[PDB]
Design a protein around this ligand. Structure first.
Ligand SMILES: Nc1ncnc2c1ncn2[C@@H]1O[C@H](COP(=O)(O)CP(=O)(O)OP(=O)(O)O)[C@@H](O)[C@H]1O
Ligand SMILES: Nc1ncnc2c1ncn2[C@@H]1O[C@H](COP(=O)(O)CP(=O)(O)OP(=O)(O)O)[C@@H](O)[C@H]1O
Ligand SMILES: CCC[C@@H]1C[C@@H](C(=O)N[C@@H]([C@H]2O[C@H](SC)[C@H](O)[C@@H](O)[C@H]2O)[C@H](C)Cl)N(C)C1
Ligand SMILES: CCC[C@@H]1C[C@@H](C(=O)N[C@@H]([C@H]2O[C@H](SC)[C@H](O)[C@@H](O)[C@H]2O)[C@H](C)Cl)N(C)C1
Ligand SMILES: [Mg+2]
Ligand SMILES: [Mg+2]
Ligand SMILES: [Mg+2]
Ligand SMILES: [Mg+2]
Ligand SMILES: [Mg+2]
Lengths: 266, 266
């Protein structure tokens, strides 16, 4: 894989460069899920007093020639290399390595070994041993209530804009509804490790039954298709709620979902 | 309108309640766009001493009985009243009233008069006057570049996950692409006030030609429809880039977009 050649380059350069004190890899190549379709991604920890003006544009070209480079909404440098591999490099002071513990909340981190690329001081390895084995419990009453409330809110907003004739906006809301629904399916089927990344591995991780029901909640930009998708979204959540009620005390009841259902033809 | 009755109750209670110093309304009922499909929304500014313990659930019930209340991801109290009207209420200390001037970054502020629901001290009116008539100018090289780079980033990521067979994830990414594409159309057509709310009034605000093109970038959860939508997504952005390049210096060139296009079948 071209990706692995680039990863090796990153390891090489982060070790040899005096400006870089640590490098943490994350993503699929640290979880046995890397393939030819994957990107590569790192936190690059820099000498504190040279962090502001660090020439990351030049450093990234030293990794490999690139076609495009910009800073995304998360402050991460994103590169499209000339071989079309995407790379995400988050550059920050070594003094901000204390961000790492909060990563335990992002998902299941069974192993940390592939994450350790370079570690000048030993501090990176120490932070990683704090998150190694991290596994958020997603199967909570709190989560079930938030998702059902969040869905009801978004569904009602969506059906309203649809009734107005704001079709494109109802489609946008439907995609937000869909993310929430995936999280509900993962709750109902007790396979919720891929939580924030709810669509990762979906074809491998959920029942055909609910996959097909989810597919029915999708639509192109079309009034009739949107109405069908919105209706099927509600029906699916009604199924999920009647399953989840057995496990949690829910504030969104079948009655409340029934009122939303009736509203479609109002 | 049920909405107007509820706004009236909010006006009534915010005035009379000694714990509430000011109430600012926003959204479509302050922008000449309110209708039967609208929600209602307010910032409620509380006397500083009681902000910490204020029982919002109790107060919102006084506005009208509700079927559902929860805090969304923005910390907004979101309510579905028992007549199925949606309400969004942001409770803050009076001392945070100075967040108001930053609202000018969100878009055009046509009517600060309709925004003033209650103002004990005259303070709210003063902050609102600072934003009246204001709008960002979205027509910039910085915006053209970010959107084209962000689109290219998300598109290449999305086509990779589609090729992988992660269809549900490619759909999720497609919806993110779609929002970037609406902002790009708004730049090209120079109708960019509805920027963060890019799909608001979309059917009324962009040309029939670009609406039709945008509609072809949409898909249901289906391999063939997804490949069609991803191609049409890039082709639309290629059209838009050819216009934008005349106005701004752009990092994303036609040649780069063509590399991405050829990548679909590689
Ligand atoms: N919404 C989210 N919030 C927080 N962390 C997330 C997240 N989505 C993904 N992540 C984390 O960031 C890592 C990198 O994510 P991405 O590169 O977007 C997908 P990936 O799992 O690396 O697969 P891929 O790049 O091979 O397609 C993921 O493995 C996950 O640990
Ligand atoms: N993404 C965003 N970021 C920041 N502000 C936004 C935003 N989207 C919308 N807004 C602002 O928040 C106001 C209320 O938004 P919404 O209630 O979601 C839509 P609306 O314009 O009120 O129409 P509607 O409620 O009648 O359908 C908008 O009018 C706009 O001023
Ligand atoms: C052990 C996981 C480390 C991850 C590092 C950190 C992070 O930088 N995530 C990014 C996150 O952003 C998107 S997915 C929304 C990218 O596709 C992904 O590769 C990653 O860079 C955002 C801030 Cl969520 N995440 C919170 C967890
Ligand atoms: C005069 C506009 C005032 C608005 C008030 C403030 C706000 O609370 N916006 C909300 C925003 O959130 C979503 S749309 C993302 C809601 O649909 C919308 O009614 C509004 O409540 C988020 C924090 Cl962006 N926005 C930054 C601007
Ligand atoms: Mg990755
Ligand atoms: Mg990534
Ligand atoms: Mg509104
Ligand atoms: Mg609203
Ligand atoms: Mg009461």
């Amino acid at each position: 894989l071209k990706q692995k050649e680039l990863i090796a380059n990153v390891k090489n350069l982060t070790e040899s460069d005096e400006r870089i004190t640590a490098c943490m890899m994350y993503g699929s190549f640290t979880k046995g899920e890397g393939d030819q379709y994957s990107d590569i991604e790192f936190y690059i920890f820099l000498k504190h007093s040279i962090t502001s003006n660090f020439d990351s544009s030049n450093w990234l070209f030293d990794v490999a020639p690139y076609l495009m480079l910009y800073k995304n909404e998360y402050g991460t440098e994103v590169v499209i290399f000339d071989n079309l591999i995407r790379g995400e490099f988050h550059f920050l002071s070594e003094k901000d390595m204390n961000i790492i513990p909060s990563f335990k909340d992002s998902g299941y981190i069974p192993d940390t070994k592939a994450m350790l690329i370079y570690d000048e001081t030993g501090q990176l390895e120490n932070y990683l041993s704090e998150i190694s084995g991290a596994r958020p419990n997603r199967l909570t009453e709190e989560n079930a209530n938030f998702l059902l409330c969040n869905f009801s809110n978004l569904w009602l907003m969506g059906i309203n804009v649809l009734k107005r004739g704001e079709y494109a906006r109802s489609l946008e809301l439907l995609s937000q509804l869909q993310k929430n629904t995936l999280q509900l399916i993962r709750m109902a089927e007790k396979n919720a490790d891929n939580w924030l990344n709810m669509s990762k591995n979906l074809e491998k991780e959920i029942s055909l039954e609910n996959y097909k029901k989810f597919a029915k909640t999708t639509a192109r930009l079309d009034k009739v298709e949107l109405f069908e998708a919105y209706k099927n979204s509600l029906l699916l959540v009604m199924d999920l709620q009647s399953h989840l009620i057995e496990q949690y005390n829910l504030k969104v009841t079948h009655d409340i979902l029934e009122r939303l259902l009736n509203y479609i033809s109002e």
